[PDB]
Design a protein around this ligand. Structure first.
Ligand SMILES: [Cl-]
Lengths: 94, 90
């Protein structure tokens, strides 16, 4: 039962607690909108975790790959994730 | 048992098993990936935190306005989720 404010690891927990309090009929449209945010956010988290699983299986788990090779691939993927906020990313492309 | 929810725990485990001196460069590289991934997650949680602060906690905004802002941020995030990277600028 934390007294500290704006703890990042609790951000989704607090959104959930806010949703759970929206019981009045006039608050229902907001509640349904929040449900959608929550679903979309969870999908984002899942896809990020899959990025790790993909890296882990294709790079680290492969006995066929040399250590120098794996190190190269590992440095690359970190650099890519690092640049993501400055990346040009096109919605509904190709 | 390799659920994606454990993806990070697994990477941290693998890092904790690279003990040979010749593996040390890969180990440091993996530490970097773990740090960068945690940063990614932290910034994602701050997205929720900032939305919560700016929209949901502002009781000067009507329920209608909060709803509109909540719908629009999800729409933006949904697009960002299917967006494909074509480059980055330094
Ligand atoms: Cl080797």
């Amino acid at each position: 039962m934390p007294v500290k404010k704006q703890e990042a690891h609790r951000a989704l927990e607090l959104l959930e607690d806010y949703h759970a309090r929206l019981s009045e009929p006039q608050d229902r449209a907001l509640r349904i909108a929040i449900e959608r945010v929550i679903r979309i956010f969870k999908s984002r988290l899942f896809q990020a975790l899959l990025d790790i699983q993909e890296f882990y299986e294709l790079t680290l788990l492969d006995d066929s790959k040399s250590i120098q090779q794996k190190t190269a691939e590992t440095l690359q993927i970190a650099t890519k994730w690092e640049k993501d906020g400055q990346a040009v990313k096109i919605a509904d492309f190709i």
